[PDB]
Amino acid sequence: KENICIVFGGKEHEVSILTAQNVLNAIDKDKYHVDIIYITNDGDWRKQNNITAEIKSTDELHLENGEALEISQLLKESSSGQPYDAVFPLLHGPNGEDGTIQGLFEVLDVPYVGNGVLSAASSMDKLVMKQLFEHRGLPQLPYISFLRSEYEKYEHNILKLVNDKLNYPVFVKPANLGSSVGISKCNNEAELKEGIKEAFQFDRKLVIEQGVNAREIEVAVLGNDYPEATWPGEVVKDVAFYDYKKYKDGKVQLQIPADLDEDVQLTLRNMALEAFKATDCSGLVRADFFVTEDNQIYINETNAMPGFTAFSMYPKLWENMGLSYPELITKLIELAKERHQDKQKNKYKID
Amino acid sequence: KENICIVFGGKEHEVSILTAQNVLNAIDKDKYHVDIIYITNDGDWRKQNNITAEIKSTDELHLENGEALEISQLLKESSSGQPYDAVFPLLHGPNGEDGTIQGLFEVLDVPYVGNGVLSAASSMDKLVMKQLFEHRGLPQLPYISFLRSEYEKYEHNILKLVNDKLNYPVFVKPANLGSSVGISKCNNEAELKEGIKEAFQFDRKLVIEQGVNAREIEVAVLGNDYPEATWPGEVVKDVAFYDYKKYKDGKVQLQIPADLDEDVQLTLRNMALEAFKATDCSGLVRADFFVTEDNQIYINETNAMPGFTAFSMYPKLWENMGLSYPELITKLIELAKERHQDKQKNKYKID
């Protein structure tokens, strides 16, 4: 058996916990020895050893009453007594996909699924992500950015650059948040200024982005050095608007593949690979696009740890390619093994 | 008293250990309670509690025989029984300035000196660093970059782009190393190809850089949101060459301020601040420039944790401004406190 540890929760949990239930029930307990570590909202790490049956309800998860050892000892050793072959972060904290847990994993020399430090961190900062996309030549909506320090001195002058380079309406976006906290849509300077002031309560760096009305199209990418991209998918919505949040009850309504011309789909698959390379991803990414009704394409953002329930977009895009959810989980673990092995080979060849 | 922890060593140590001796002997043991954690080449963490006298020889450091508790307990609590007010990483491992230890620090919610995760990681990847410098408008030598995957398919085609955009000689540079391992200077394709092949043994991503002969000029930057830059300094060298390494015995020979026109110095101070902002630095950075004999300026790289002995360039640049080495250490701790406090204020205002 191989030795796996799923880390879930994070310093709101209900998605992460549902995800960890799905990932657990889709792992062959015959091929894998599975421990899990739950991170409480407090930040405390609680381990639960040796999952061996299906998790039918969240009650079966020890959660905050798990075994409360130091984080060092929790990750060094499987309950089986072997070191882990892969650790799978399914976190919904900021420490989830800002590169921080990945940094911990590297310091502890623990092999792990998904994106590395620089990749996760730069996909979480919206300014760095766009700067990397730009250098790579991917099309994006016209955009501006600045630090609070610059706006305190150049308010009047920054607003002019907005009206020259962009067309209203624009969106004010905090650079470093994982949440819709502080985003607003502004139809003029008056609203823009109010919006900028309003976002600086939550962040020190802002992106101003030209608005579009467009379809949201997502592509799943999987791999390390030779990644592959799925056919695109769509969350079907008769009306494009920024909701600020999923309000409709029940399952989300996916269309996979998306109802797009076959040429446009191929363009999006190739753009997804470019977006993966532009932030030097590992393991996986979801590329999220804006596609207007006249088939104009912009890349919106990448997502370094995308939604990963059994009905989420990222796994359902791979199902459409023939890759089962249990096969996808196993592939992510093998990629984690390979990236990890490739680093001692380099750390060795450095002598 | 405030509570400080110096982390030094790292998974070669002699500079880091000399540095930790200097930083220790320059801290007022009356104002600060000082513990230190030593990271062995093995990666093991060993704590030594409550430094209270001058460290006259490295023998007085417990080093690898320090107290061998789990890393979690080592950082959570000062020997005094209080949580730390600041942790000061003085590491010479890759885990030093690739953002990994900083990620650990954030996961453990430990306040810490210097650059954050994204800042350290992006200053260590030479491709991302140049891409950020470019977007900011700082002048750099003409350069190319590619992944191993791209060169395996486009060898012939990538070499042409080199000869069109650059002028020989060029330097082949691994993107992700902190070491001179795999750098070479090439006067033609024949050498370039050999050089590219030679660097791929140690890295998966490369930068090809146009060579210059120039003076090396360094500027020290200190601050968080309102940073300040020193007058520039110079390691004086009658002959510009890439040494691959300091060979001369004894002290390095600094000229502070550098023998440059007063206008050129002011330009470099302002470029240093731009370079700090371009990678969203915190705490400090050293901006390293190429300045030709005809006063043409290029930024070479930033250094997120620069040399920090008492005779290193970064502290000596601040001494020239009137800031003593003990005052600089204290300023770095206050900045660590401020960045840390500013994050709960935001994490609070996010509700």
Residue numbers in the entry:
A (entry chain A), B (entry chain A): 3 to 13, 16 to 249, 251 to 356
Please give the exact wording used by the authors of the publication that reports this structure.
Ddl is essential for staphylococcal growth and produces d-Ala-d-Ala dipeptide which is incorporated into peptidoglycan to cross-link the peptide side chains of neighboring glycan strands. Ddl has two d-Ala binding sites and one ATP-binding site, and DSF experiments were conducted with various combinations of these ligands. We demonstrate that acetate anions bind to and inhibit d-alanyl-d-alanine ligase (Ddl) activity in S. aureus.
